[model samples]
Target chain A: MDFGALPPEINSARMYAGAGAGPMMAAGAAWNGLAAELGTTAASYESVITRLTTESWMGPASMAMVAAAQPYLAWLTYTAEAAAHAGSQAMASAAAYEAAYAMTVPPEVVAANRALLAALVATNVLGINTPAIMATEALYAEMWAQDALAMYGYAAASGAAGMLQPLSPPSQT
Target chain B: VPEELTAAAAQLGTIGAAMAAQNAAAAAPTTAIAPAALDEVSALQAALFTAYGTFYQQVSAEAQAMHDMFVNTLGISA
Candidate 1:
């Protein structure tokens, strides 16, 4: 349960890998210009820039630009994905903690129980289900997690009510 | 009100409080200010020292304001 070292989801990584490509396109735009300036003009900077911009071709120059910027781009995409979730996770955790004082959520015992659940889910930094909802083709999955958990709780509650209905026999007296 | 929406609103209010806290806290110099005195540095530490002083009082003001707003001013009862 060493979540401090939790790994990114495969799809999260993949989503962000595409994220890397966008920044690299810009890097290539700049790199291609630099390439020509430094006499690495295997292709004209204009077309290389154009192709990278349009994504019509992911040829050597486009890819090379991507490659050169890979480290920073990779870091940005990975952390950016993590960063988005991290915010939601923090908010969830903080809210749960603050629930202690929230009179509206009172019955201190209930708040305590729910807070435990919130922390449990928040701690799973890498639990993102990438395919569940993709906004701009990627987003933090914790929001979805929060949704699912609440949904499950309601379903379980109604199911419990349904189960008890027959046993109590809904007396019409 | 549905339990989920209640939870969601509470989360929103709590987050607003935390955001206000963070923004207020950032009122400190963006670039590290060389501690005005010995006590100044410790106030920036994540956890408070028992004897921590005015700097914290300043930083947490909005956080307190936000928490109050959500729980008191704008709070809706379930």
Candidate 2:
């Protein structure tokens, strides 16, 4: 829906559709980060539980301790999974909204540095300020980068690339 | 408690402290998921995520409380 040719109605509809893209995208990124942290905490908790449960040296306290902490692990795992699902769904929604607003680019690519450069192109070609779009593109980049760190293992602060310098505090997940 | 049990209890103390720190670090991001836009759907989604975060915070606290008690008991015995 190119609002340029279709006039006021198209412009309004397109505006309305993309209005929530930023928020939804933000939420999605936050959820992914939440998922990463939850997974880290859960894995750490599991390690503690395992240290005791498998230790024949601990004798009777082993099983007893496991029983006490088992339920928490269950909830943590569920919540992490739920967060991942919510994050993905939110990204899908943002992509649809971006499409409806006439962004002719792949969501994955759009969230990459290439898209940030593309924002610069828009600024140059149209002779219009595009700080807002550039900022949103930066947010998208951060979101995908965080999601990538979550999906693969996170890099050490020293190992992180220029933009993602210092990944979130170390995680065991 | 045996010497090995004493060592284990000390290790448990370290683990509990780490767990507490992790939860504390998580508090801000989890409890307040802000909406980027002013639209109703954005607001609603933020609210929902906040609710989930709040619930997890509660659950994690309760669970930690129990674990702390067990750790304390073990330490005392040691």
Candidate 3:
């Protein structure tokens, strides 16, 4: 089984599986913003009081969202990693089974084992209900990817965050 | 009492007005005073008023004493 050259569906599923990182990144960014805005700042009495009364909610809510999404994102990451590793193992096991059967096995037994080998390889590589997991991971990834992109894009677009392309060390002209 | 204390009270009022204007300008973003910022400015204004009142009371008492001394020393009837 040439896992490297697997069909596009597998490739897409793998890519989608890896996408949980985006939401995790978004949650991190939100927390960072909340901390920067609210943490340890000197303020006027009225400012402090009002912030204590009202703006304080933003900090907790940002924290809660990050906490809530963390486990789901972690599971997605673990599943993706497991899938990649399991795919490699399945390929190696299938090749070994074929080699063992080719040397001395009876024809009928070899044929039956070949069928079993195929099922084993498919089961190990595909895993149970992986299509559903992949679909779910992909959907989550797309949603989070959009959210993360929107956040970072807004930061970049609004001039809130970006690297300044260094001036071509003063053009000679 | 003394004219100086009266003037100080008026100055305190002016300071209040100036602080209010500054606060109004700063609050233009939300179209209303940010409660925290307003409180900070208001604190400073209140401190000024408290100091002014204390000084005014002291000055008025001294002025009344001085006026009495002048009247008694000059043998003037009140």
Candidate 4:
């Protein structure tokens, strides 16, 4: 569909393609690198299982989520900080992400990055809920995705441009 | 036929009795034996260690991303 012409909430996700593309791409690169390294190191199925069990790939995946979220959070905070009282929801959402991120990753540097993304997503959601900040929050969400992908080495493909797509809708009627 | 054989017989009887007790213990529904609980714990420990390493790298990337984004977008150096 012609997503570009959609309302601000929908259209804002496009910004991820523009500004936040780097990190996702980078994250993908890191994953590829790790996978390749794993392949070279493991010779047999048993060894592979052993490595997987020993190495815990899920932890990295979780961290990647956090990394992807950080910049998004910053954007939210910035937008909120700049807007002051008008930015209350955005700020509060940013704070929520911050808290979640902190709780998610502990004694680990990745938590900070995850917090950022959480903050960004929170801001985006707040923007969607609050029409006045819709365009800016949407744009920030878009940028957040772009940077996240770039960070992870993932391409910002056109089809994957919508942040609102992932929002869990209220229990369907 | 001698003292040694008598002692060996006694030991065998004791072992057989112990085996019966062990079998009974195994049969009990309330307190079953776990043959691999130690192994499971070991595997869990290994997994956690692995997870820690993986988490470390992932979190590091996130932190770096946050720092970079903050600096670039907000002009706030991290």
Candidate 5:
């Protein structure tokens, strides 16, 4: 039980992270709300895609049992948020004493950047975030061959990304 | 008459102790707890403490009544 020594760096980072929790919750609320709406009825492929990627998800509903996909759709966004969180930690940090740079594109390539980010967010939110969080709720899982350095590194990054997560257009589920 | 009261006291004591222990464990963590979990922790503590303190006193009172009856009514020694 790493009963917690709340190191200054982690504590400080957590303070910073705490600052962002409200917005993250807002984002989660937004995702949950929109996804719930999107999943209620059949959606266009683009609507489903946009629900996960963009907010302008109103499209033609082709499939009759679109409601059946609700849980999976919600998971897609939720898990994506988790993935975005991990990647952000792995990529940048203040406690790690690293410089922060957005590998994002120039404003001139606005559409391209948005598209890229949307895709990235979609892939990771489902592919990475959801899986990692659900992998094991047990804090200490018999030393399941994962490094503490790596685990917390992601949390720090996840927390960081989470703070400004709403800014990432594709950061939702 | 106090037979059932004595039994009720023991049962309430057991329930209260269990709730207190669970609440204590919930609060033992150094890490942050979710809002719902935190609420239940406090709720259980308050409910247990209130009920525990009140009912155990009732137990002692009834048990005392029984003791008093045995000595006075039955003309038994204290």
Candidate 6:
């Protein structure tokens, strides 16, 4: 029942592998870039909105145009906020995956586990179709582990809907 | 009708281009978050991240379209 450590080579050969920490980190950067670009775009639009309001020549007609454009400008601002949150979540998910990678069981244990499973499959001393029984149990164990990871990993990115907030309407002054 | 509004309209196109380029650059890395393993949990992670990416693309495109209209209208007006 007790699985213990083995030689470094055995553990190294059998133990944990890749998780896309690199890609996740890269994705985090990309998301952050996206958010910045979105914010810049919103700023650009807001500047134009600002000018339309202040210019003396831009009278009632300009005022009406600003009114028309306010929603569009507000939408851009809100979208920028959402993108910022997405960027933060991407970074958080990257950290979560890195933690998971660090916690992976050593290769030695993995190798030993494989060997034990093979022995169980080969033996009928316990009962008929021992292989099926062992395989089914092992499969369940794997899926349960996967489910736990998913539950936690996916939980990192939260507050999807409530983050959006529309910008207020512009003033005439 | 003023030079300022005309310049501003042209600036929107530049801003739009920047937004589009960054978004395109982001698409692959964000949408294709590869799973760590063959397990269902990894697959779920992939799907969840991909959905976040795909959703962003959709929202961005909507705003981009609106931006385009503004650019075109302003450019034409000026």
DockQ of each: 0.01, 0.10, 0.01, 0.02, 0.01, 0.36
Model 3, B3-70: lDDT tens digits are 43234334433433443343233222212111111112222322332332234234324433432332
Q: Taking chain A by itself, what TM-score does each prediction score?
A: 0.26, 0.50, 0.27, 0.21, 0.23, 0.56
- Candidate 3: the clashing residue pairs are A46-B36, A47-B36
Error of 1 at B4 (Å): 52
Looking at model 3, residue B71 earns an lDDT score of 25
Best by DockQ: 6
Residue pairs of candidate 5 with colliding backbone atoms: A77-A173, A79-A125, A80-A125, A80-A126, A82-A129, A83-A129, A85-A158, A89-A157
lDDT of 6 by residue, A9-97 (tens): 22223224445666666666776787787788778778887877777336777776676666667766666676677666666755665
What are the lDDT scores of the predictions, listed in order? 0.30, 0.53, 0.30, 0.31, 0.31, 0.62
Comparison by TM-score, 4 against 6, better one = 6
Task: List, residue by residue over B1-78, the lDDT tens digit for candidate 4.
Answer: 224323433443443344334323322211121111112221222233233334434443443344344223222211
lDDT of 5 by residue, A1-173 (tens): 23133322232332222222222232233333333332232133224334423332223431221343333344334434533443342223222322111221122333343355456556675466544344432322322212233334434453443232321111122
Over 4 Å off in model 5, which ranges? A1-20, A43-151, A154-173, B1-78
TM-score of 2: 0.50
For model 6, the TM-score of its B chain against the native B chain is 0.85
TM-score of chain B of each: 0.38, 0.85, 0.44, 0.35, 0.39, 0.85
Number of clashes found in candidate 5 = 8
Supply the DockQ value of model 1: 0.01
TM accuracy, model 6: 0.68
| CAPRI band for model 6 | acceptable
**Candidate 2 C-alpha lDDT tens digits along A1-173:** 22132323223332343345665566567667767766776786677667656665458766765765565566567767766775675566455444433432234444455566675766676656577567766665554443333222211211121111111111122
lDDT of 3 at A36: 31
Residues A9-42 of candidate 4 have per-residue lDDT tens digits of 2222222122122222322233333333222322
lDDT of 3 by residue, A37-127 (tens): 2122112212322432454433555344234323322332333333233223323322322232232223343344335545555665548
What residue runs in model 2 are displaced by over 4 Å at the alpha carbon? A1-26, A51-53, A58-61, A103-173, B1-26, B30-38
Q: What TM-score fits each model?
A: 0.22, 0.50, 0.20, 0.18, 0.19, 0.68
Worst 10 residues of 4 chain B by lDDT: B29-38
- TM-score ranking of the models: 6, 2, 1, 3, 5, 4
